[PDB]
Amino acid sequence: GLPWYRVHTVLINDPGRLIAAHLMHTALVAGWAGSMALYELATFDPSDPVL
């Protein structure tokens, strides 16, 4: 069997599942940016941009 540190090499000669992995990565990054701004808006206080 593959060792744990090599599981993602199944994609090397598989252009579509490489594209599918790459799309999922992109989904999680955009998801994160969405989530992170939502938490920032829920905790940001905008009543004083001076101090």
Binding site: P46, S47, D48, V50, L51
Partner: protein, 122 residues
Amino acid sequence: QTLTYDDIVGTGLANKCPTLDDTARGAYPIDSSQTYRIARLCLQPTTFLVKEEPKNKRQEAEFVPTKLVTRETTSLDQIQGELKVNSDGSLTFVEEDGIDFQPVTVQMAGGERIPLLFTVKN
């Protein structure tokens, strides 16, 4: 014109005060040996401003505009009272009765709701 309830109902015009013609700019003679009365006073608000809270450093609070959320429920009408003629010549209105209050709720930036009793009682 002489409209009717059925003409007005559900349009929002019931929350509107009457208007005079742009050409109506004469003058009402007042007569010391007479006694007067407001038979109808109507007040229709168009804007609600609320003083923001300036921080512990402050500098100066401005009045910030707000958003009406309670709909076309805001107007004072059918207010009556006598109009005295004073001795220095001035005129004084003394509210007696009418629909002289409306609870209104406006909303500030950031979602603070501010209720108030819009009123001219007494």
